Design a protein around this nucleic acid. Structure first.
Lengths: 103, 127, 63, 135, 206, 37, 63, 143
RNA sequence: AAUAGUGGUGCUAGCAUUUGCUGGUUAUCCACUUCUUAGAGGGACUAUCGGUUUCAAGCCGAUGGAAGUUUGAGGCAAUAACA
RNA sequence: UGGUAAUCUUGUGAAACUCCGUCGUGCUGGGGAUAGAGCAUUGUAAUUAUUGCUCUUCAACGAGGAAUUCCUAGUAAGCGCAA
C-alpha cells in the first residue's frame, strides 16, 4: 500500500516495449494509480582505435558503439498485488529493479 | 481568459521561446527592454519585424521572450524568428485571414528567413 | 572614345588549353545585323552587355 | 585637455648611476632602461614615488631623482614584500637585496665560478654546461 | 509623423522617416545612377538594407551570386589573411565608419561615390592567362560582365591593406581617400594605377 | 598486465575492462560493441 | 617647447576640411597622446562639429 | 513609471554608481592594493590606480542581482581574459581569490549581501530596499 | 514527464508607485505539454509548369516546399609476389 | 559537503569577438627564445632544470631563394580546451 518505483535499463529495444506494456497491462486490470513510463535520454559508449595489429601503413581509425536505453515507472499498489507480478515478467538481457523510496 | 500563444525560433542550435499576451505592449528580451542588446551594430536587425508594418497593432499585446544556447551572434537571429512569426498567431486564432496575409506577404517579400529558419547544420571531420 | 556596345545571342562552347575562354555569338546593338563571334573570358549567359574595342580583328576559333 | 607650455628644461641625458635616459617618455618606462628593473618591478616604485604617472624628464623635481634610488637602496624599508625581489636568501649571507643596472654582473660570475671550477656547495655536475657547451 | 507610444518607452528617432519609405538609418535608395550599360542588370539590388549583414545562400549556383547587395560584397572581401577570417562584426564597424567620412568630404551622396567608382575599374580589355604552348604569348580576348564586376571591386580593396599597413593612419582613413580617388579618373591611387597598365599592355597584346 | 598477443602497452584502461587492443578487435563483438558509423 | 603647441593649432585649426589624428601627426614631435589631447582640448573649444566617435576613432570636422 | 535593475545601461550604470561610492569611502581597502593584480594571467596592475577597487566591488553586486546565489568559485571563473603561456598555446583564465574573499565580506558591513541557507551569499531586503533605491537614484542620470 | 519545463493559486520581498513591472521557494496546491526527451507513425518522388535533345535516357530554368549538389555525412562488400 | 547518476560537480559563465580607456610607430610598451636568485605541490625517489606560480633578464626575429601542400558551402580558415 506504498508508493513504489521501478527501473529497467536494457539494451534490446524490441525487448523493452513488451515488458513495459505488460507492466502497465496488469496494473490497469487492477486499476492502480500510476504515472506513465518516462523514457530517459539514452547513453552511447565509444572507443577509437586504429585498425592495424602492427604499425606499418596508412592512418585512419575505427569507432565502436554500444547503446544503453533506460526508462522507469512510478507506481502505488498493495504489496500482495505487486510482489507476484514482478516475478512473471522475466526475459534474458533485461534488468528489473524495485524502489519503494517514500522519504 | 487572455488571448495567449507560444512560438519559437531557432538558428544553429539556439532557441528562443516566446510568450504572447495582451496589454499596453511590452517587448521583453529575457527580462529587459529590446533597445538594449549588446552587439550594438546588430541593434537594428531586431527592429526589422517591428519596422515593417508600422507601430500600430501593439496597444493590445504583450511579448515576453527568453533564449538559450548559441553564441552572441545567433541569438540576434533567433529572437526575430520567433517574434515575427509570433504576431501571426493572433491573426490565425483571433483576427481574420485578410489581416494575416497582408503582413505575411510583407515579411516574405523582404526576408524569407524571417519566417522559415535556415537548414545549414555542421559536419563531421576526418571521419 | 570608340565604344563597341555588344549583346550576346548564342553560346557555343569553351576552347583553350584549359577551356578558360569561351566562344559565343554576339550582336552589335547599334547595327542589329552584325553576326560575329567573340572570345569572351568569364561566366557567360544570354542577354549581356559587352564593352569592346577592336570591332573587327578577332580570332574566329582557337586551338 | 589643455595647453601647458613649459620652457624646455628637458634632459636627453640623465645621471642615475651611469644611466642616461631619453626622458621624453613615461617615467615608469624611463627606469626600465636600466638593468635589473623592469616594468613588473618599476611599476610600484613610481606609485611609491607619489607623482603624476604621465610626465617626461622636463618637469621632474630635483629631489625625486634622489628619492627614487633612496627607495631603491632601502627596499624593505617602505613595505616591499619578499616576493618582490630578485636576490633572495643568499648562499653567502642569507639576506635579501635587489640589484641596480651595473651590478647584475656582480653576484653573477663569482656565484657561477664556484659552480664552474671549485665543485661548490651544489655545483659538481652543474659543472660543464656554462663551461663546455655554453661557456 | 504621429509618434505613437507603447508600454515600452520607444525612442522617436528610430520611427521618424524609418516608418516612412526611407529605409537605411542615414541614407536611402532613391538615388539610382546608371553609367555603364553592363551594370544595368544586377549590381544595384533594388532591395532595402539596414545593417548590411545577412546569411546569403548564393554560393551554390553561380548566378544567385549576383543578387547579393554591393555593400554586403565589399565587407566580405575584408577578410584578408590569417587574422581576420571571420571577423565580420569588425568589418561592418569599419564600413559604417567610412560613409560618414565620405560625405563630410565635400560631396552629396556617400553610396554614390563607390557605384561610379566601379564603372572605371571594370577593365574593358584583358590579357589571357595562357602562355601559348611554349611561345609564352598573349592573344585576343575580352571579359564577361559578371566576371568584370568581380575583379573590379577586389583590386580596390587589396590596396588599402598596405596603404594602412605599419603607418599611423587607420583603415577608414584609407578607404576614404581611395574611393574618391577611384570615383574620378585620376590614376593616382594604387586601386587605379595597376588596372590601367594591365589595359595598356592589352592595347599592345594580339 | 600483459594479457596475450605481444602487448603490455596500449591497454584500454577506460570502462574498467583492461584489454590489450590487439586482442580487442576480435573480442569486441561478444562484449556487445558493434560499429555503425 | 612653448610655441609649436601654440600657433599651428590655436590659430590654424579651421583651415582644413575635417579633423582626425592624421593631420596632427604631421610634425614628428606631436606624438600619440599629444595628438590625442589636441582634440581632447579642442572639443572643449567648440570648433569641433562632431559626427561620430568611439574608442578606436572619432569622426570630427570643424565649425 | 517604475523600473527594476534590469532596464538601465550596463557599463554606464556601474560608472555612475561607483563614483557615488567614490564619494562614500566606506570600504576596507587593504594595504596591498598597489601591488597585487587581479589574477595571474594578467601582466600588469591596472591603469586605474584607485577606482578599480570600486569597480569590481560594484559589478559583483550587479551580478548577484539577477542570480540566486554566488559563491567564490564562480567569479573566479568569470573575469575576462586569456592566460598567455609564452610560446605554448593559450588557456582560459582563472582569477585570484584573496582579492575577492574580502570584497565579498566588505559588503556585509553595509547591509547588502549575505549568506543564503542554500550555501551562497545573496542580497536580502537590506539591498532590496536600498540597492535598488540607489539604482533608482541612477534614474536621475538618465536625463 | 519532481531525475524536463513553462501556466496559475498562494505564503513573500521590492515596489515609480496607485492598477504595475521584476523577484519569492519545496511540497502553496492545481492545471498543462509549445519548447525537452524517447517510442509509434508520416512526409520527397526531382513534384508541377516552361525550354532543350533521335523528343529517347536525361540536362537546364522556373514557382511551391523543413528539405530539390546520390537531400547533407559515414558504415559495409576480395583480384593480387611487401615471407 | 554533494554526486553510482538527465538530479550533484555544471548553466561546465570557454576563447576569439564586444564597448570604455591607456598607448604612438621606433624592430618601443610588438616578440619572449637562453638564462640566475627563489615558494609550492607527486611519489621509494625529480640533480641532467618531471611539472607550476614569484622578480629579474628582453638576445634570433622587418612577410621568407629555388621549390612544394593531411584540409570542399555553414565548406576554407581562425577560436576551442572535453575524452
Amino acid at each position: 500500500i506504498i508508493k513504489i518505483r521501478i527501473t529497467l535499463t536494457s539494451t534490446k529495444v524490441k525487448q523493452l516495449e513488451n515488458v513495459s506494456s505488460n507492466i502497465v497491462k496488469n496494473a490497469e486490470q487492477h486499476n492502480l494509480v500510476k504515472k506513465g513510463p518516462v523514457r530517459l535520454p539514452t547513453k552511447v559508449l565509444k572507443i577509437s582505435t586504429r585498425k592495424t595489429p602492427n604499425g606499418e601503413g596508412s592512418k585512419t581509425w575505427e569507432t565502436y558503439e554500444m547503446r544503453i536505453h533506460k526508462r522507469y515507472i512510478d507506481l502505488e499498489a498493495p504489496v500482495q498485488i505487486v510482489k507476484r507480478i514482478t516475478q512473471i515478467t522475466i526475459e534474458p538481457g533485461v534488468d528489473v529493479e524495485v524502489v519503494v523510496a517514500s522519504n | 481568459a487572455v488571448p495567449s500563444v507560444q512560438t519559437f525560433g531557432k538558428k544553429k542550435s539556439a532557441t528562443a521561446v516566446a510568450h504572447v499576451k495582451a496589454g499596453k505592449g511590452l517587448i521583453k528580451v529575457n527580462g529587459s527592454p529590446i533597445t538594449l542588446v549588446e552587439p550594438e551594430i546588430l541593434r537594428f536587425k531586431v527592429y526589422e519585424p517591428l519596422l515593417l508594418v508600422g507601430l500600430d497593432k501593439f496597444s493590445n499585446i504583450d511579448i515576453r521572450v527568453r533564449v538559450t544556447g548559441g553564441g552572441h551572434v545567433s541569438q540576434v537571429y533567433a529572437i526575430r524568428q520567433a517574434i515575427a512569426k509570433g504576431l501571426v498567431a493572433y491573426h490565425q486564432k483571433y483576427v481574420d485571414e485578410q489581416s494575416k496575409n497582408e503582413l505575411k506577404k510583407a515579411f516574405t517579400s523582404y526576408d524569407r528567413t524571417l519566417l522559415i529558419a535556415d537548414s545549414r547544420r555542421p559536419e563531421p571531420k576526418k571521419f | 572614345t570608340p565604344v563597341t556596345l555588344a549583346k550576346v545571342i548564342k553560346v557555343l562552347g569553351r576552347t583553350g588549353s584549359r577551356g578558360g575562354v569561351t566562344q559565343v555569338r554576339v550582336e552589335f546593338l547599334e547595327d542589329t545585323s552584325r553576326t560575329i563571334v567573340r572570345n569572351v573570358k568569364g561566366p557567360v549567359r544570354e542577354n549581356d552587355i559587352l564593352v569592346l574595342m577592336e570591332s573587327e580583328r578577332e580570332a574566329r576559333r582557337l586551338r | 585637455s589643455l595647453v601647458v607650455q613649459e620652457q624646455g628644461s628637458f634632459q636627453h641625458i640623465l645621471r642615475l648611476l651611469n644611466t642616461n635616459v631619453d626622458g621624453n617618455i613615461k617615467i615608469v618606462y624611463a627606469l626600465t632602461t636600466i638593468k635589473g628593473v623592469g616594468r613588473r618591478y618599476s611599476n610600484l616604485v613610481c606609485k611609491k614615488a607619489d607623482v603624476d604617472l604621465h610626465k617626461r624628464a622636463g618637469e621632474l623635481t630635483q629631489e625625486e631623482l634622489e628619492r627614487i634610488v633612496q627607495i631603491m637602496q632601502n627596499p624593505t624599508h617602505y613595505k616591499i614584500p619578499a616576493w618582490f625581489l630578485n636576490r633572495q636568501n643568499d648562499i653567502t649571507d642569507g639576506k635579501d637585496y635587489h640589484t641596480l643596472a651595473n651590478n647584475v654582473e656582480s653576484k653573477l660570475r663569482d656565484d657561477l665560478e664556484r659552480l664552474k671550477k671549485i665543485r661548490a656547495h651544489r655545483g659538481i655536475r652543474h659543472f660543464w654546461g656554462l663551461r663546455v657547451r655554453g661557456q | 509623423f504621429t509618434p505613437v507610444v507603447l508600454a515600452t518607452p520607444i525612442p522617436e528617432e528610430v520611427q521618424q522617416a524609418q516608418t516612412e519609405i526611407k529605409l537605411f538609418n542615414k541614407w536611402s535608395f532613391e538615388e539610382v545612377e546608371v553609367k555603364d550599360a553592363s551594370l544595368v542588370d544586377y549590381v544595384q539590388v533594388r532591395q532595402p538594407i539596414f545593417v548590411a549583414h545577412t546569411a546569403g545562400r548564393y554560393a551554390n549556383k553561380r548566378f544567385r551570386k549576383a543578387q547579393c547587395p554591393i555593400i554586403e560584397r565589399l565587407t566580405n572581401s575584408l577578410m584578408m589573411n590569417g587574422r581576420n577570417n571571420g571577423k565580420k562584426l569588425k568589418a561592418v564597424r569599419i564600413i559604417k565608419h567610412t560613409l560618414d567620412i565620405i560625405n563630410v568630404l565635400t560631396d552629396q551622396n556617400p553610396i554614390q561615390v563607390v557605384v561610379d567608382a566601379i564603372t572605371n575599374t571594370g577593365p574593358r580589355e584583358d590579357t589571357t592567362r595562357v602562355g601559348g604552348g611554349g611561345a609564352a604569348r598573349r592573344q585576343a580576348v575580352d571579359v564577361s560582365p559578371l566576371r568584370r564586376v568581380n575583379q573590379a571591386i577586389a583590386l580596390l580593396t587589396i590596396g588599402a591593406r598596405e596603404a594602412a599597413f605599419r603607418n599611423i593612419k587607420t583603415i577608414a582613413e584609407t578607404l576614404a581617400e581611395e574611393l574618391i580617388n577611384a570615383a574620378k579618373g585620376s590614376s593616382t591611387s594604387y586601386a587605379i594605377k595597376k588596372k590601367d597598365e594591365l589595359e595598356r599592355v592589352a592595347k599592345s597584346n594580339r | 598486465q600483459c594479457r596475450v598477443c605481444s602487448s603490455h602497452t596500449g591497454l584500454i584502461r577506460k570502462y574498467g575492462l583492461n584489454i590489450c587492443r590487439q586482442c580487442f578487435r576480435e573480442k569486441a563483438n561478444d562484449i556487445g560493441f558493434n560499429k555503425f558509423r | 617647447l612653448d610655441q609649436e603647441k601654440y600657433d599651428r593649432i590655436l590659430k590654424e585649426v579651421p583651415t582644413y576640411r575635417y579633423v582626425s589624428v592624421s593631420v596632427l601627426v604631421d610634425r614628428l614631435k606631436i606624438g600619440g597622446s599629444l595628438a590625442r589631447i589636441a582634440l581632447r582640448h579642442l572639443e572643449k573649444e567648440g570648433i569641433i562639429k562632431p559626427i561620430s566617435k568611439h574608442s578606436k576613432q572619432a569622426i570630427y570636422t570643424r565649425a | 513609471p517604475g523600473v527594476s535593475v534590469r532596464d538601465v545601461a550596463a557599463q554606464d550604470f556601474i560608472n555612475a554608481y561607483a563614483s557615488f561610492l567614490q564619494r562614500q569611502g566606506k570600504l576596507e581597502v587593504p594595504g596591498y592594493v598597489d601591488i597585487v593584480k587581479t589574477s595571474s594571467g594578467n601582466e600588469m596592475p591596472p591603469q586605474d590606480a584607485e577606482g578599480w577597487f570600486y569597480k569590481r566591488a560594484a559589478s559583483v553586486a550587479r551580478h548577484i542581482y539577477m542570480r540566486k546565489q554566488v559563491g567564490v568559485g564562480k567569479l573566479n571563473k568569470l573575469y575576462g581574459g586569456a592566460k598567455s603561456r609564452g610560446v605554448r598555446p593559450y588557456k582560459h583564465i582563472d582569477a585570484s581569490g584573496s582579492i575577492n574573499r574580502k570584497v565579498l565580506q566588505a559588503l556585509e558591513k553595509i547591509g547588502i549581501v549575505e549568506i543564503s541557507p542554500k550555501g551562497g551569499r545573496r542580497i536580502s531586503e537590506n539591498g532590496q530596499r536600498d540597492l535598488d533605491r540607489i539604482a533608482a537614484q541612477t534614474l536621475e542620470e538618465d536625463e
